[PDB]
Amino acid sequence: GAMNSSNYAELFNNDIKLFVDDTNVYRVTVHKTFEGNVATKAINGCIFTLNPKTGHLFLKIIHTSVWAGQKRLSQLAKWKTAEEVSALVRSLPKEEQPKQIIVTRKAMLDPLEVHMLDFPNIAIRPTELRLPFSAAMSIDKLSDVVMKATEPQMVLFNIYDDWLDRISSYTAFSRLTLLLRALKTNEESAKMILLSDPTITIKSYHLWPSFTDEQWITIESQMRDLILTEYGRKYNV
C-alpha cells in the first residue's frame, strides 16, 4: 500500500525502487494574446525518476515538440510519463529493474499500472509523504540541461554527488529532501545559503557544493531556519 512515515526505512533496503515525480513534465507560461485572450506556451520539462538508495537520477527531458497538435495536455502528460518510465524499465537489465515504483502523485497510479501490465511483479505504490521533488528545476545544472534540450534526451545524474562515501542513504535522502524543501519554500534564500562563501565550489561532475562534514551541519541548520521562518509568515504563527 501507500509509502508513509511508518514504513520510511523501506526506502533504504536492498529491494531496487524508484520514485517517479511528474510535476515538471508539462510546464507552461500563461500570457495575454494580441486580442487580450489568454494562451499558454509550453517550455521543456522533465520526468524526475530517482533511486533513493543509490542517488541514481534518470532525468528524462520532455521537449515541447511532444505536445505539438495534442489535446488535454495535463492528461497526456501523465500517460507520457508512464510511457517513458515503462520504456526506462524495459531498457534496464533484469537485475537492475525496480521491484517497486513509488509515484509522488496519486493521478500517476492508473497511467503507470496500465503501461506496466507486462511487469505484474513490479508494485506501483502511492505515498503519503509530501516530497519536494518539484523543486528539482531549482538545481541549476538540472534546469540548464532541460532548458538547452533541442530534442528528447535522457541524462543520468547522481543527486547525492559523493555523499554516500561519508553518510548512509537515509541521511543522504534527508539532506536532499531538506535542500529541496528549502529551495521550494524560498528559492532565492536557499541558493544564497548554498553559494554565499565563494571558496566552496561545485565540482564539474557534481550538482551541490563540496561542503566538509562541519560545513554540511551549518548549511542544514541554515536550511531548517529558512523553512521555519517562511512557515510563520505563511500561517501568521
Binding site: W79, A82, E83, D110, P111, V114, H115, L117, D118
Partner: protein, 300 residues
C-alpha cells in the same frame, strides 16, 4: 401454459416465481405453480422462514422438460428435478389442478415486465455460466462466487461470467495504453462483441442474467458483473446506435423492478454517476437517467 408441481411443502418458506412471491406455511397443502408463460426462461426461488440466509433457486424453461420441486430433508432444501415419464407427470399435474392445490402465475395481460427483464436471456447460455450438465435447469444461490472473484474456491459451484477487467492485457493493446484505457471501444467491440460474445444479444443476455441473480439472490459477484458490463458500454465512445437504445430499455426495466429498499446495496454510486453524468454515453440513456433521477436521486 406449463406447470411446476411440488411434491409437498414440509418447511415454511417464501417462494418466488420470477418477480412474484408467496408465503407457504409448514406442511401447508401446496402443490406448485401453474399457468407459467411459455417462451421465457423462469426462476423459482426460495427463502426459508427459519433461516432468511441463503436465498437459492432454479432457472428453467418448461419447453426443455417436465420439472418439479421436492424437499430433501437430508440437504435441507427444495430441489428441482426432471420427471422423464410424461404420462406420470401429466397425471400428477391434472390431479393437483383438479384439487386446486396450485397457485397461478399471476401475470397481468398489459404487463411485459418479465419479457423486458429476460429479452436476451437463453437457457443454453445460463447452462454455460452455471455448469451442471446432467440437469436442464440451473441452481443459483446468494453465496456462489464468480470465476473473477475466485482468481482474486470450489470451481464446480462458480458463476462462469465472462471476465471483464479494465486493467488487463486483454483490455489494453500494447502501444494504445492511454487510448484503450480512456476509450474502451476496442475492448467492447473487438475483444468482447466480435471475439467472445459473437453478438450484442449474447452480451445483453449475460448482463440481464447477472442483474436478475443480483436482485433475486443478493449475489454480490453477479452485481459486480452487471455493473462491469454497463460500465464497459458507457466507457466506449463508439457503440452501435441499436445497442445504446436497447441498453437504455434494458436498464430502465431493471431500475423499475428493483425493490426501492435495496438500491443502497444493489446500485454502485461510482458506476451510475460516471455512466449517467461523465461517460461518452452520458446523453444516450434518456429513459434510464429519467427513472434513476426520479426513483433514486440520493445515490446521484
Amino acid at each position: 401454459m406449463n406447470t411446476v408441481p411440488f411434491t409437498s411443502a414440509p418447511i415454511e418458506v417464501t417462494i418466488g416465481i420470477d418477480q412474484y412471491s408467496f408465503n407457504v406455511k409448514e406442511n401447508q397443502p401446496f402443490h406448485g405453480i401453474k399457468d407459467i408463460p411459455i417462451g421465457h426462461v423462469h426462476v423459482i426461488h426460495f427463502q426459508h422462514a427459519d433461516n432468511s440466509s441463503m436465498r437459492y433457486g432454479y432457472w428453467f424453461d418448461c419447453r426443455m422438460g417436465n420439472f418439479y420441486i421436492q424437499y430433501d430433508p437430508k440437504d435441507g432444501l427444495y430441489k428441482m428435478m426432471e420427471e422423464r415419464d410424461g404420462a406420470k407427470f401429466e397425471n400428477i399435474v391434472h390431479n393437483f389442478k383438479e384439487r386446486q392445490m396450485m397457485v397461478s402465475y399471476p401475470k397481468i395481460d398489459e404487463d411485459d415486465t418479465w419479457y423486458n427483464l429476460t429479452e436476451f436471456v437463453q437457457m443454453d447460455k445460463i447452462r454455460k455460466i452455471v455448469r451442471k450438465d446432467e440437469n436442464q435447469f440451473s441452481y443459483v444461490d446468494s453465496s456462489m462466487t464468480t470465476v473473477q472473484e475466485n482468481e482474486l474456491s470450489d470451481p464446480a459451484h462458480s458463476l462462469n461470467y465472462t471476465v471483464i477487467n479494465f486493467k488487463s492485457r486483454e483490455a489494453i493493446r500494447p502501444g494504445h495504453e492511454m487510448e484503450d484505457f480512456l476509450d474502451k471501444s476496442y475492448y467492447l467491440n473487438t475483444v468482447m462483441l466480435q471475439g467472445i460474445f459473437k453478438n450484442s444479444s449474447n452480451y445483453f443476455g449475460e448482463l440481464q442474467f447477472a442483474f436478475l441473480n443480483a436482485m433475486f439472490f443478493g449475489n454480490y459477484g453477479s452485481s459486480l458483473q452487471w455493473h462491469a458490463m454497463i460500465e464497459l458500454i458507457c466507457s466506449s465512445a463508439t457503440v452501435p446506435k441499436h445497442m445504446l437504445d436497447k441498453l437504455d430499455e434494458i436498464l430502465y426495466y431493471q431500475i423499475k423492478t428493483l425493490p426501492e429498499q435495496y438500491s443502497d446495496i444493489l446500485l454502485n454510486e461510482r458506476v451510475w454517476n460516471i455512466c449517467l453524468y461523465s461517460s461518452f454515453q452520458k446523453n444516450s440513456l434518456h429513459n434510464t437517467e429519467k427513472i434513476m433521477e426520479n426513483k433514486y436521486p440520493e445515490l446521484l
